[PDB]
Design a protein around this ligand. Structure first.
Ligand SMILES: [Mg+2]
Ligand SMILES: [Zn+2]
Ligand SMILES: [Zn+2]
Ligand SMILES: [Zn+2]
Ligand SMILES: [Zn+2]
Ligand SMILES: [Zn+2]
Lengths: 384, 64, 1136, 48, 205, 114, 79
């Protein structure tokens, strides 16, 4: 069974072996019911959260972000290829944004043809700075992070999950509220076909090069971790010397864990941000995160900076042995390494203790997934 | 099982190079040198012989 | 001299190589079975009481010695012959060895004359034999000899062949016996509960559990609150809890000082004394041993008619049913008082907070029941039955005054069928008592992959039921390090419950504690019966297998002596655990089976006892006789169980942790041989597994079990129900050190693929894959699907029989629209004949009481060629035919493919070579995966393997992806790649195949090992359009193989209600499933009798036939109303 | 070897065999809805 | 709730009302203590007036208290308990058919004992078995009672077991069921289809 | 606070007063034996129960290889530099992070808290 | 065809003094009971000399005919 990529989200479907069922209505009366009530275009906006249930995902979302960048220019031949994949195209080639020295169409120009009707939408790109709205360039965005669709044309802004995903106020949401299901149906198909074929030119990959960082970034990450180790050691000395005053409402043990977890959480955040800054505009990890197609800033930090603290039942790795987590540690070892803080990134690789503690943390997610499927299923049935 | 006739990637013939490859290794050649001696320059073809497992030799041990 | 860090990596893998050269990978299976045959079977026969007959002449029978011959098969003519395992598989025989016993028969005739006759080697049944065990025919056969027998030398054995089915006993995980465990139940009425599961030595009559519990303080009262919490004991065979002090009185300790001396070893401690005061007051009424015994007897299993019977019964329970492991004799009351006091003492420490509560998830507190202990448990029951019927048979003859024939008294079916049935079905115990029988112990061995086969032989089953849900048993406990793979575990209901042994983990087979006890007595250990209770406080208790043997005043010297003996293998065998709890002043020694242990390098004075001389001797492992066992004899490596690991200070590596550095630990006792040994068989094939997110490692361990390859070298001789063989398996370009011991090179399950991580045409999105059509045209991931059909013709009944023949449409009653032309005259299709769906491969006709058709129809989807047609006699002597159909599976759209990092995906499209993107060299990727699969999954090991694979292919060297290896870094791999004229990060400039234009972004491309998974779309595609219906519900059948319909369940129904599609909902649930019509009486809503032929409708009960209404309802609704009517309910359908 | 009246497979109750007919209603396996027999208990019993 | 407080009959025959106690399938009336036979309960219920039955929340025309006592046992049609053919022409009877054999045998044995005038204790033991077989014909999961096995250790599936649960008659065959004209196979991407299109194999079509 | 058993039948002795003498006495239930009471305190209940953990520590813990050893806390008795430190890890304390030191010198099981 | 009562679980299953009130009773016919015992004897003999199950099945059929024909009713079933 072959499916459009957009309907994968409403179905919660993937293509790693998922099987879907087909039911063929056997009469006109039931055939008309499905046609007039249950067709995918009529299902675009869900009443659960008064927003679209399917959007632009994976390649098209990652590519449309690249496509709508300010500096994307298309030659005459490239543009004519894309218009072949625009079913709603009127057949009129728009005047290029640049006429001399060479005729060049921008990506926004071609996307404007995809946008149906004359809808008007205002969105912000994921990387839109907060202080730009208060600055002197509110309506002329230096970063192209302000999305304005006016009269059905994308006049500025980079499109991403925020303006094309399954969120209220999305450009896809406006198309449904304004143009209806049939025109919105063509909107989704036209975005995919046009930008999928442009991605054949621009391309998109992910490799080792996107997991590396500058030696300066590695030193900053190493220094941040080294400082975090000393900070946890200092707190341990205070607790050992009875110099730690319990925070009101918490026991001494709870106070110590809060301080240690706060130190290591901040170190993970500081190392993560340090890794993110080092990433270039060409970085493919960042490309799929800014577009919202896949991954998050935490994934990037884990791959580059540090995996971080491994937790079991919301606590650091417990003393499964007698007062120690593993036979490789001394007893009463409350340092970050003993209790499951992974100071390495995935690229660097985990040490044997980190690998095992990381396996302990991963097992919790697997147990939850098995539990969540049945625990929530019973709730759904009883509610119905 | 047996040395594929062609390289899977480019279609170069590699099924006439397994015995020669084994002989070169018998002659103290390193695997990289033996592959170079056989003319397998693309790493797709080097993959074919460098990673081949000749199980047909084991199967010939069983009587028909 | 000493191993320098520059040579440690080679040195440590020489050690690991020698371990596997000796032990293999199914050693736990084979060693456990060998112990059961060599020792347990003989012990069970020796332990059996002599059979005494008296009804006058007196007959005695004693079973002296056990003999076992080679696995033998008897032809229908009665000629014995050795049974080869391959013959057992083909002819569906059970691989069993005849069992013989020497029986001595002495008769006393009251004439002062004794006649003694011995029946040497009396046949008493057949024992299934584990393959490649000491008693298997393949034992001691060279690899050349195995091939001559059509046996794969790489086949590890460790499984049984029952009715031709390869059966593997899964290690059953259970809480350790004879050990006192204190647990706290939040909800229960007891604040704390100290249990002990006591079992006899050699695992006699099953374990007897005793609970010592402290009542919770929840109860509010002036008397209850003032006294505190009282301790009660839950003895076996007693309905109600018995106060603890009463049990001590029944043992023979009346005075409070005497009882407290067994519970409290230091009266100077007042806190513990106050804890037992409420218990003393509870039993103040009982002040005599006989009164206490009567009190316990009053609650006995059966009511006591008189006091004398009650006292006798109570003494019986305490003597043997209570703490049997402590003692089962009449003089063991003092020993049981001390142990029972220790249980109370342990409970007090838990209540006082002085000792931490025991952890059920700790594997020190766990035992794994392997084939031996499993088989021994069955054999004890069967042998008792054998003697029970021997007594019953001999009683009848001796009663009549005639002597009895000993051979005719023995029923050989008892042991032969009892052993066979338990292994055949997996229901553990008795067929009659299947209600309490443990299920899933025996499983058909998985032959999907050689790795899957190895994994199934090292599987561990948790005691917790799969249906039950509880996170804690499913969690990855700290104590699984080095013992259980932290990654290999199934996904779903069995997460964390089914486990796999770590690579070097070993399960103790068990040994007698007699040599240890004798040495302890010789050493300065004071016996428990000779000391005064006051001396226990300062001394350390000595426990051997959970039995408190005595006390010692110099624990440090004793432990050093014990450790020295075990390292020298003088009196203590290697698998014996010696644990000293310094804080608790206890030394625990364990010798029983089921303890998980792993070999560790011994460290003395921050120095490995392993030196360069050991490595040099191992390097010449052959022609030198130096092996792994010499390392254990030399005392440089010793086995450590989970309990002993708590007391071990262990160094991950010698190169770093032993060396002088910032002072962290200057007292190291042991060292890992290599940290990569924490992984099991399936996780050991993951390259760079320490660069992946942990769930990805778990997913690959599952996927690797489903990867096609060559599951076994002799697959051609085998006729398995399903078998997948890859045309061109390759060994991975990027391998792990551990893979050398999994025989993965010899039986690979994948191909090295040029993989580009690119967004090409949108056909690889959402975990989908683009495959190169041209590469597939060249045999890339081509595989064979072998399916075997077995049919047996059996004659059973007065005139009913089944035969192989071509059923003529006129002669035979039953018939189908299939094709019967392919069948030969003998009713069997011939090899080399193309067969499609709805084709008959076996022509079977059963005589009608003319003859019905039971012919075997080829699977509808299947379209192959008959490969082999084997005909023989099965175990029952009936003519037996197996037909293998061969179908070649070319990778299609929808076939699953995975890397070794949890990145599975179906093929979304196949492009030809010209359509694929190419490098400047003309290289096109065999596979294109979406970049979006990497970021969220964080399978960085996939990217490193691709980079390392590129270097390996260019350099000509198989890359090393062993997890915790500082010698390999991404920067190092990148620098190597630069030397071959490639971008150091594995990117290449690719050209669009459709246009030839350079792609703006450079594509990460390189060799990656992928594996074709068993799941092929053509085996899953299923369509239903008015098929057959089932008899009970008259609804579409179930299953793809039965042309069943898809279920339109409650969730699908709830969904259509929200849609408001009432008519479509009616179609699915009424029109498309089971449309039915009934006639209902109008006066009463009951279904009326309708005769459409006569057009007469009557309602028997209303005496009316004019007003009957036709009602259209689902057949299942009719069945419901009729079923409700069977319960006297009257569902009356009213049309008004 | 044939169904007997008053037995457990009374032919008046159903046609569960494909090649059969119901005595009560002269219907086949599909046509016949099945018919209820009864057992007259010697002494009354409680309905659980 | 109101009648439980009362302990004397008031009406006529001012008498002490026993405290009814149930031990498994048997009712005991304690005042001393006697075994409350089903026929005794039948006689008591037969004499309850229709108006009194209405007060007890029982419509007399649709449910009389005495009908709750099993006097005549309904025998399900064959279609309710069909024999399944497997491994030759050897019918395997349904669990209900197997249970009906026990009921028919015990009541036949019970009838002969009454006609033969057997001892009262012999008949009482027979009545106990008849109560058990009848009870486990409807519900074989009786709490604290032995299960009815299938001569092989597998408990019989009674009528109650057939209707309850996810795989029961109601949820498994009425609220949801298997349907014709349905297809299942693996799903793969197709960016060249519309969001409202599905690519279908020719074999399914 | 102390516990006594009668010298006659070695059973638990419980407190009792005599009105004639108005002096605390310990009397055995099943024995009729009586004894003069010298403690005068029937029992003491320690809600805080700040029991000195040093008493609970065993000097043998210095032989544990898994306990950390520090040379910066010399033994106060013998002056040995090396000492082994650990936490109480005892329930009912409601708070425990302080270290308890034990001298590693053999025959000197000195224990202290910093 | 018949069903065997299982083992009691709760206190309601057991009589006033231990023994279970619901006990299995033998409804097996004398002819079937004797025939069942003969088949058990036939299998016991066959296992002694390792006869295949097909010969046992033929023997069981032979015994049923002889047992039903009743010409050997005077002879012992084992013979
Ligand atoms: Mg999926
Ligand atoms: Zn090539
Ligand atoms: Zn009616
Ligand atoms: Zn009918
Ligand atoms: Zn006394
Ligand atoms: Zn000191």
């Amino acid at each position: 069974f072959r499916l459009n990529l957009s309907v994968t989200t409403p179905y919660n479907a993937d293509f790693d072996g998922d099987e879907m069922n087909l039911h063929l209505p056997q009469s006109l009366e039931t055939r008309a019911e499905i046609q007039e009530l249950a067709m995918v275009p009529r299902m675009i906006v869900t009443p659960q959260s008064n927003r679209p249930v399917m959007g632009i995902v994976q390649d098209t979302l990652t590519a449309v972000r690249k496509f709508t960048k300010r500096d994307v220019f298309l030659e005459r031949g490239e543009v004519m290829n894309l218009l072949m994949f625009l079913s709603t195209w009127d057949g009129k080639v728009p005047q290029p944004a640049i006429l001399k020295p060479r005729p060049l169409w921008t990506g926004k120009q071609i996307f404007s043809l995809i946008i149906p009707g004359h809808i008007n939408c205002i969105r912000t790109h994921s990387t839109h700075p907060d202080d730009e709205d208060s600055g002197p360039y509110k309506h002329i965005s230096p970063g192209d992070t302000k999305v304005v669709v006016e009269n059905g044309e994308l006049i500025m802004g980079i499109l991403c999950k925020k303006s094309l995903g399954t969120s209220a106020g999305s450009l896809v949401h406006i198309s449904y509220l304004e143009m209806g299901h049939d025109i919105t149906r063509l909107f989704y198909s036209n975005i995919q076909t046009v930008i999928n074929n442009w991605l054949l030119i621009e391309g998109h990959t992910i490799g080792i090069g996107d997991s590396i960082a500058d030696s300066k970034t590695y030193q900053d990450i190493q220094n941040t971790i080294k400082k975090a180790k000393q900070d946890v050691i200092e707190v341990i000395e205070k607790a050992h010397n009875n110099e730690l005053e319990p925070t009101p409402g918490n026991t001494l043990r709870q106070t110590f864990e809060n301080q240690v977890n706060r130190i290591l959480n901040d170190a993970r955040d500081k190392t993560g941000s340090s890794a993110q800054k080092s990433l270039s505009e060409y970085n493919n990890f960042k490309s799929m995160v800014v577009s919202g197609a896949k991954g998050s800033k935490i994934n990037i930090s884990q791959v580059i900076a540090v995996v971080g603290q491994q937790n079991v039942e919301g606590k650091r790795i417990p003393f499964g042995f007698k007062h120690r987590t593993l036979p490789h540690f001394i007893k009463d070892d409350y340092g970050p390494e003993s209790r499951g803080f992974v100071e390495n990134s995935y690229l660097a690789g985990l040490t044997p203790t980190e690998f095992f503690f990381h396996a302990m943390g991963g097992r919790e997610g697997l147990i939850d997934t098995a539990v969540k499927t049945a625990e929530t299923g019973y709730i759904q049935r009883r509610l119905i | 099982m047996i040395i594929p006739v062609r390289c899977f990637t480019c279609g170069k013939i590699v099924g006439n190079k397994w015995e020669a490859y084994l002989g070169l290794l018998q002659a103290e050649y390193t695997e990289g040198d033996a592959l170079d001696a056989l003319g397998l320059k693309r790493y797709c073809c080097r993959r074919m012989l460098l990673a081949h497992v000749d199980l047909i030799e084991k199967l010939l041990n069983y009587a028909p | 001299d000493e191993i320098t860090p520059d040579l440690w990596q080679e040195a440590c893998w020489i050690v690991i190589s020698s371990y596997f050269d000796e032990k293999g990978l199914v050693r736990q299976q084979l060693d456990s079975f060998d112990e059961f045959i060599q020792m347990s079977v003989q012990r069970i026969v020796e332990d059996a009481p002599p059979i005494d007959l008296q009804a006058p002449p007196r007959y005695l029978l004693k079973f002296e010695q056990i003999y076992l011959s080679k696995p033998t098969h008897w032809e229908r003519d009665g000629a014995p012959s050795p049974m080869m395992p391959n013959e057992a598989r083909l002819r569906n025989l059970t691989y069993s060895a005849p069992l013989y016993v020497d029986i001595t028969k002495t008769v006393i005739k009251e004439g002062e004359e004794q006649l003694q006759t011995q029946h040497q080697k009396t046949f008493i049944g057949k024992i299934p034999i584990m393959l490649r065990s000491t008693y298997c025919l393949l034992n001691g056969l060279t690899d050349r000899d195995l091939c001559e027998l059509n046996e794969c030398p790489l086949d590890p054995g460790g499984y049984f062949i029952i009715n031709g089915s390869e059966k593997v006993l899964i290690a059953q995980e259970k809480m350790a016996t004879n050990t006192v465990y204190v647990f706290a139940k939040k909800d229960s009425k007891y604040a704390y509960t100290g249990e002990c599961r006591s079992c006899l030595e050699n695992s006699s009559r099953p374990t007897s559990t005793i609970w010592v519990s402290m009542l919770a303080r929840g109860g509010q009262g002036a008397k209850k609150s003032a006294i505190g919490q009282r301790i009660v004991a839950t003895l076996p065979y007693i309905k109600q809890e018995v106060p603890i002090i009463i049990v001590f009185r029944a043992l023979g300790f009346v005075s409070d000082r005497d009882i407290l001396e067994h519970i409290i070893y230091d009266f100077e401690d007042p806190e513990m004394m106050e804890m037992v005061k409420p218990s003393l007051d509870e039993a103040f009424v009982i002040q005599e041993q006989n009164v206490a015994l009567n009190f316990i007897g009053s609650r006995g299993a059966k009511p006591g008619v008189t006091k004398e019977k009650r006292i006798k019964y109570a003494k019986e329970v305490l003597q043997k049913e209570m703490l049997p492991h402590v003692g089962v004799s009449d003089f063991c009351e003092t020993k049981k008082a001390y142990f029972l006091g220790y249980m109370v003492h342990r409970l007090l420490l838990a209540a006082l907070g002085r000792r931490e509560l025991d952890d059920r998830d700790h594997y020190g507190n766990k035992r794994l029941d392997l084939a031996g202990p499993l088989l021994a448990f069955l054999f004890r029951g069967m042998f008792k039955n054998l003697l029970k019927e021997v007594r019953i048979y001999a009683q009848k003859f001796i009663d009549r005054g005639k002597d009895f024939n000993l051979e005719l008294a023995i029923k050989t079916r008892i042991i032969s069928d009892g052993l066979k049935y338990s292994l055949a079905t997996g229901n553990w115990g008795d067929q009659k008592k299947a209600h309490q029988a443990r299920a899933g112990v025996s499983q058909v061995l998985n032959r999907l992959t050689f790795a899957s086969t190895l994994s199934h032989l090292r599987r561990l089953n948790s005691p917790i039921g799969r249906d039950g849900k509880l996170a804690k048993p499913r969690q990855l406990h700290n104590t699984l390090w080095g013992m259980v793979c932290p990654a290999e575990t199934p996904e779903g209901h069995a997460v964390g419950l089914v486990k796999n042994l770590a690579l070097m983990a070993y399960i103790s087979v068990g040994s007698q504690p007699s040599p240890i006890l004798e040495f302890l007595e010789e050493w300065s250990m004071e016996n428990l019966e000779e000391i005064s209770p006051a001396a226990i406080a300062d001394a350390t208790k000595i426990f051997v297998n959970g039995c408190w043997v005595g006390i010692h005043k110099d624990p440090e010297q004793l432990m050093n002596t014990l450790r020295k003996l075990r390292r020298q293998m003088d009196i203590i065998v290697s698998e014996v655990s010696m644990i000293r709890d310094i804080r608790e002043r206890e030394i625990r020694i364990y010798t029983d089976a089921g303890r998980i242990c792993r070999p560790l390098l011994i460290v003395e004075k921050q120095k490995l006892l392993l030196k360069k001389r050991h490595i040099d001797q191992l390097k010449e492992r052959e022609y030198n006789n130096y092996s792994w066992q010499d390392l254990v004899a030399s005392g440089v490596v010793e086995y450590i169980d989970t309990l002993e690991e708590e007391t071990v200070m262990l160094a991950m590596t010698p190169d770093d942790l032993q060396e002088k550095e910032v002072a962290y630990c200057s007292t190291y006792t042991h060292c890992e041989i290599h940290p990569s040994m924490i992984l099991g068989v399936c996780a050991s094939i993951i390259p760079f597994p320490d660069h992946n997110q942990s769930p990805r490692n778990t997913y690959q361990s599952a996927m690797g079990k489903q990867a096609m390859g060559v599951y076994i070298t002799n697959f051609h001789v085998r006729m398995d129900t399903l078998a997948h063989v890859l045309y061109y398996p390759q060994k991975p370009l990027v391998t792990t050190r551990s893979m050398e011991y999994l025989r993965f090179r010899e039986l690979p399950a994948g191909i090295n693929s040029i993989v580009a991580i690119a967004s090409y045409t949108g056909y690889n999105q959402e975990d989908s894959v683009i495959m190169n059509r041209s590469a597939v045209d060249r045999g890339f991931f081509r595989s064979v699907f072998y399916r075997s059909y077995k049919e047996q013709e059996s004659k059973k009944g007065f005139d009913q029989e089944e035969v192989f023949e071509k059923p003529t449409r006129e002669t035979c009653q039953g018939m189908r629209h299939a094709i019967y032309d392919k069948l030969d005259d003998d009713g069997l299709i011939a090899p080399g004949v193309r067969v499609s769906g709805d084709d008959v491969i076996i022509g079977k006709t059963v005589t009608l009481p003319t003859k019905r058709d039971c012919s075997t129809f080829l699977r509808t989807s299947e379209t192959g060629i008959v490969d082999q047609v084997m005909v023989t006699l099965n175990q029952e002597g009936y003519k037996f035919c197996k037909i293998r159909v061969r179908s070649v599976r070319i990778p299609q759209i929808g076939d699953k493919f995975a890397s070794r990092h949890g990145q599975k995906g179906t093929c979304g499209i196949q492009y030809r070579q010209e359509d694929m993107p190419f490098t400047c060299e003309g290289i096109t990727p065999d596979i294109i995966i979406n970049p979006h699969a990497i970021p969220s999954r964080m399978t960085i090991g996939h990217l490193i393997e691709c980079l390392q694979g590129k270097v390996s292919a260019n350099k000509g060297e198989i890359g090393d992806a062993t997890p915790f290896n500082d010698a390999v870094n991404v920067q190092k791999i990148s620098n190597l790649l630069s030397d071959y004229g490639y971008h150091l990060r594995g990117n290449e400039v690719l050209y669009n195949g459709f246009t030839g234009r350079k792609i703006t972004s450079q594509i990460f491309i390189g060799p990656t090992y992928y594996q074709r998974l068993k799941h092929m779309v053509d085996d899953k595609i299923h369509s239903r359009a008015r098929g057959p219906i089932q008899i009970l519900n008259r609804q579409p059948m179930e299953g793809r193989s039965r042309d069943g319909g898809l279920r339109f369940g409650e969730m699908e129904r709830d969904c259509q209600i929200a849609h408001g599609a009432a008519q479509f909902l009616r179609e699915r649930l009424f029109e498309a499933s089971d449309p039915y019509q009934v006639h209902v009486c109008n006066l009463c809503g009951i279904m009326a009798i309708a005769n459409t032929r006569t057009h007469t409708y009557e309602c028997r009960g209303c005496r009316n036939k004019t007003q009957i209404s036709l009602v259209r309802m689902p057949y299942a609704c009719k069945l419901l109303f009729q079923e409700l009517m069977s319960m006297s309910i009257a569902p009356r359908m009213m049309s008004v | 070897g044939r169904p007997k009246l008053g037995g457990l497979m009374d032919p008046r109750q159903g046609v569960i065999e494909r090649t059969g007919r119901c005595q009560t209603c002269a219907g086949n396996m599909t046509e016949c809805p099945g018919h209820f027999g009864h057992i007259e208990l010697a002494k009354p019993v409680f309905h659980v | 709730d109101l009648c439980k407080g009362k302990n004397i009959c008031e009406g006529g025959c001012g008498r002490y009302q026993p405290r009814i106690r149930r031990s498994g399938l048997e009712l005991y009336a304690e005042w001393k203590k006697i075994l409350l036979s089903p026929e005794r309960v039948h006689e008591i219920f037969k004499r309850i007036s229709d108006e009194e039955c209405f007060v007890l929340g029982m419509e007399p025309r649709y449910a009389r208290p005495e009908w709750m006592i099993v006097t005549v046992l309904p025998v399900p049609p064959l279609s309710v308990r069909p024999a399944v053919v497997m491994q030759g022409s050897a019918r395997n009877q349904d669990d209900l058919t197997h249970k009906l054999a026990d009921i028919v045998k015990i009541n036949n044995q019970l009838r002969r004992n009454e006609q033969n005038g057997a001892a009262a204790h012999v008949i009482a033991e027979d009545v106990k078995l008849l109560q058990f077989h009848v009870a486990t014909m409807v519900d074989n999961e009786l709490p604290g009672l032995p299960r009815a096995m299938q001569k092989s250790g597998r408990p019989l599936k009674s009528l109650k077991q057939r209707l309850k649960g996810k795989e029961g008659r109601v949820r498994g065959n009425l609220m949801g069921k298997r349907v014709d004209f349905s297809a299942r196979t693996v799903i793969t991407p197709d960016p060249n289809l519309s969001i409202d299109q599905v690519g279908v194999p020719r074999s399914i079509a | 606070v102390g516990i006594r058993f009668c010298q006659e039948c070695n059973n638990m002795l419980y407190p009792k007063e005599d009105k004639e003498n108005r002096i605390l006495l310990y009397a055995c239930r099943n024995c009729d034996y009586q004894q003069e009471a010298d403690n005068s305190c029937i029992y003491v209940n320690k809600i805080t129960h700040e029991v000195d953990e040093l008493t609970q520590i065993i000097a043998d813990v210095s032989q544990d290889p898994t306990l950390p050893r520090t040379e910066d806390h010399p033994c106060q008795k013998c002056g040995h530099k090396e000492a082994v430190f650990f936490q109480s890890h005892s329930a009912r304390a409601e708070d425990a992070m302080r270290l308890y030191y034990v001298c590693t010198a053999p025959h000197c099981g000195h224990r202290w808290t910093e | 065809l018949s069903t065997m009562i299982g083992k009691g679980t709760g206190a309601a299953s057991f009589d006033e003094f231990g023994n279970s009130k619901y006990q299995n009773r033998r409804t097996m016919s004398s002819s079937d009971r004797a025939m069942m015992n003969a088949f058990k004897e036939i299998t016991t003999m066959a296992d002694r000399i390792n006869l295949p199950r097909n010969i046992v099945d033929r023997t069981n059929n032979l015994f049923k005919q002889v047992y039903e024909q009743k010409s050997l009713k005077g002879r012992a079933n084992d013979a």
